């Protein structure tokens, strides 16, 4: 049987499956414990057992196949891979390994990988000869990711305003600058629907850091792609771990010429987690931010690029402002000019219960001429000139009215022309 | 007899009963000591002795049934539970066990459990087949907890303002941000009265950390549920132990499809106790707070959720500000955005002797559309639009003035519409 199918069943069915084959007292233990006990019980009978997971390599040399179902949390059901296997196949962290596994022997605590069947959704020989991510040439985004779905209404105005204000291309480095309760979470959710419906080919990953468990459940049940999260209950080490796990998996996928999109909420919380984890270097900036603490977060943000050889890595991360913590302000100030797309939300627009609370004038994209054609760019500059003189709330109200009058951004543009 | 009646008996009547049995020198020792002496003297007679308690499994394997009457304080009247019983009945910390108990034998210092009769207010065989707490998927609160009472005080008007300002649902994660002497204690008292009157089915728990003994007595004599408190003249380990017992018992009750509400005063004192207890990790934040120190309080505060499978855990904790202690502000900083509901008390409103001193414009609830109907939500949005331009002192003066002229919140909204 398969490990992923077991991890995808709810706890009740896992308990029933364990009980009807001989296991007992499975109800009160953790899901990973139930899965591990079921795996051992099935292995006692001797049938082939399959599994898969994203490889994480530890300092000692051996590695473990973490599962995205549990957001790459270490557990009894993790699959052990020996350094001999990590050297026989040239494997790095973030590699998606799928194959047969074997029960632990006397003196082993984890299931061990038996036969490698696929590496990064490809044969091991082909994945053996993939150029490393850092050897690829970054480029400006040139393939637009359209947000207008064309299937929804009465909230698709958010996607249409996104298309009017901030252009997202394959390989974009997007930063969403929003105060708390400004609508960033469901803005990301609507972006997720836009990406899933418009671009099924792109691999979509949603990364949540220090996020409430109920929102984690909503995001998981709501997004069609892969959602991994680390709640505020877990330590900053877990936030770090999931951050590198996601970024390494994305890099490995991009190495196979795949477009990978990562929605991050938030870069500020990840920066705080990194500041907590990394040792103090003796130089501490204002707000308690260690100077060296922001190196690793930026490396996460700087991985977003359009690869000339093939594929791309788009990263759209949210930045928190006006939260009352000056360390968040410092983190934002260190991440200001890093991204090439900016999307600003304002509390003033959100207070009047009018959404999306996008600050149209302060939002924009760099090198936007590559994403679209000349005439669409002319129409967008006409719209920019029209919107510019008037204030944030008036701009958003005007945009929402004119978009609600029409059905598509095109008809809105001819209506502006007329 | 049954131990619960003995522990709820006043000390004087306990002394008289023990003297009637034939004991002596009872008056001048601890209440637990008198209870233990009475239990031994009566068990010498030979008829059945009953007991109730909450299980706390020690690091050595065995456990102790504690009592909420003494706030789970270790004492001679604790019931001893062998690891064999923790294995035969699948038992965890926080389980409520009631059954026969037996006198200590030679070399035994505690009464020992003899026959397990009821676990978590259920038969032992049913309690072992309950899915563990963190195997249940969290959800947003959808069942509102009405604060407005049919009692009709008409001098306090706190529950009505709570309804007008911040909604509380089943599974809510609420945070009360208040300066000292602003009305925290009686705010929690009104919340507890509303919970007891409107929702008798919900299990109500009041958790007090570093609390003055007089207010512990007041809270016990006022709240109709369970009050477990730890005074400031006790070690931080005592506070931590009380918190773990309360949270584990709440989780075990939620596992039985029960709605459990915990009122905590305060999360700041609990964070200080955890910081004192936990070993230093080498990374100390501003204000002398260890990085890992806040990991365990969050696991408390993050345990609040609405369970899809049934039941919920609401936690309303008070956060303290303007105390002049950098530890307090930092604790507030890592607890700022972790709650669904926020309710802010203002010193300036309190010093005007107008109550409740709720900062209406800064208090609110996330996903409040899931707790009320569309019409009530529209009326509440209208009220927020009216109040938003006003200053918080003036806002509360206006709100109380308008509320006093009406009897119910619905009548208040109808008057506002007119
Ligand atoms: N595009 C939108 N349409 C309707 N309501 C919105 C929109 N954006 C935000 N809101 C409102 O804002 C509230 C909170 O938004 P949320 O996405 O949680 O922002 P944040 O993640 O910054 O807290 C929601 O209850 C929702 O009603
Ligand atoms: N809802 C209220 N109604 C009337 N008086 C209040 C109220 N809340 C606070 N007070 C006043 O505040 C004083 C103490 O409030 P308390 O509940 O001790 O606040 P805290 O717990 O923050 O010290 C009381 O003497 C009382 O006069
Ligand atoms: Mg959010
Ligand atoms: Mg008080």
Author numbering:
A (entry chain D), B (entry chain C): 1 to 418
Quoted passage from the original study:
Phage satellite P4 polarity suppression protein, Psu, a building block of the viral capsid, inhibits hexameric transcription termination factor, ρ, by presently unknown mechanisms. The ρ hexamer adopts an NTPase-inactive, washer-like, open-ring conformation until NTPs (preferentially ATP) are engaged and RNA is bound at the SBS, leading to ring closure and RNA entrapment inside the ring. Our cryogenic electron microscopy structures of ρ-Psu complexes show that Psu dimers clamp two inactive, open ρ rings and promote their expansion to higher-oligomeric states. ATPase, nucleotide binding and nucleic acid binding studies revealed that Psu hinders ρ ring closure and traps nucleotides in their binding pockets on ρ.
Incorporation of this additional ρP167L subunit leads to an interlocking of the two ρP167L rings, due to refolding and domain swapping of the central ρP167L subunits, most likely explaining the increased ρP167L-Psu affinity (Supplementary Discussion). Such refolding and domain-swapping in ρP167L only occurs in complex with Psu, as it is not observed in a cryoEM structure of isolated ρP167L. The final percentage of hydrolyzed ATP (reaction amplitude) was comparable for ρwt and ρP167L, but the ATP turnover rate of ρP167L was approximately doubled compared to ρwt. The slightly lower mant-ATPγS affinity of ρP167L is due to a two-fold higher dissociation rate, which likely arises because the residue substitution renders the nucleotide-binding site more dynamic, as indicated by the lower thermal stability of ρP167L. The increased nucleotide dissociation constant may enable faster ATP turnover, consistent with the observed elevated ATPase rate of ρP167L compared to ρwt. While ρP167L does not exhibit defects in laboratory assays, the proline at the 167-equivalent position is invariant, perhaps to provide higher ρ stability.
